[PDB]
Design a protein around this ligand. Structure first.
Ligand SMILES: C[C@H](CNC(=O)c1ccc(S(N)(=O)=O)cc1)Cn1ccc2ccccc21
Ligand SMILES: [Zn+2]
Length: 258
């Protein structure tokens, strides 16, 4: 009954409707810091979010998405391993029921409390739906969250969550600046992978920042009060909406830093 994160519809079941779940470039993966190799040729990342235009925040029954106007080159990601320009379309998070779990990527098997995904699509393919059909169609910037001090730039998100508690609810979310979600450093790891939710398409260049951001226990607690279910249905807390690490197979993770 439709994919999700429960025992009966979660990641171990997805391959039955989405056989690519057992494919050759699936995500997330464990990042072994002792095996990833510094790649001198990797350029600095270029994150150009000054003109970002956020529109709306939506509870889609799996996570919540903050959506952006991507009709023009307003907020873009360039550089690093990428050729060409990738437009920001949305961001969302994955998080746990407990502070010791929640991220999708792991670092030397360490799980973080949550993981932010800023999703961008390659403008050479004209639209997002065409881009997801291409091996170089998407670039997702992944940022780990640990519990510590509050992240001021996240609070606007946390405070609107009460208004999108259940699946299908949305709220206006204009004038949000995603630059407030970044850590200081843009050092990263990169590897070719996939969407981490169905349809699990193998269209993503992953760029995972090495420095986590800190959020407060109160901030992540509010994530955990969201609901997977729709209004009027039995309450199922939106927690543990993460896919575990998948086999690396014939892939190398490259580091931008020594
Ligand atoms: C694949 C798309 C739905 N999924 C996503 O957009 C998506 C993005 C990022 C991740 S992650 N967790 O890996 O960062 C996972 C899922 C549906 N879809 C198909 C065609 C299409 C056209 C326009 C809009 C949506 C469209
Ligand atoms: Zn994601």
């Amino acid at each position: 009954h439709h994919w999700g994160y429960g025992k009966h519809n979660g990641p171990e079941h997805w391959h039955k409707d989405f056989p690519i779940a057992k494919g050759e470039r699936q995500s997330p993966v464990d990042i072994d810091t002792h095996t990833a190799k510094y790649d001198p040729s990797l350029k600095p990342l270029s994150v150009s979010y000054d003109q970002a235009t956020s529109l709306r925040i939506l509870n889609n029954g799996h996570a919540f998405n903050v959506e952006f106007d991507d009709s023009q080159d307003k907020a873009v990601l360039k550089g690093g391993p990428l050729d060409g320009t990738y437009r920001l379309i949305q961001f969302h998070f994955h998080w746990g029921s407990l502070d010791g779990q929640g991220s999708e990527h792991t670092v030397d098997k360490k799980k973080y409390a949550a993981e932010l995904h800023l999703v961008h699509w390659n403008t050479k393919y004209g639209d997002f739906g065409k881009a997801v059909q291409q091996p170089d169609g998407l670039a997702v910037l992944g940022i780990f969250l640990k519990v510590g001090s509050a992240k001021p730039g996240l609070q606007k998100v946390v405070d609107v969550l009460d208004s999108i508690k259940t699946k299908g609810k949305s709220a206006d979310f204009t004038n949000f600046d995603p630059r407030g979600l970044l850590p200081e450093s843009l050092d990263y790891w990169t590897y070719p992978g996939s969407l981490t939710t169905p349809p699990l398409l193998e269209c993503v260049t992953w760029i995972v920042l090495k420095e986590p951001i800190s959020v407060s226990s109160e901030q992540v607690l509010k994530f955990r009060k969201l609901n997977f279910n729709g209004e009027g249905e039995p309450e199922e807390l939106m927690v543990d909406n993460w896919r575990p690490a998948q086999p690396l197979k014939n892939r190398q993770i490259k580091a931008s830093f020594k």
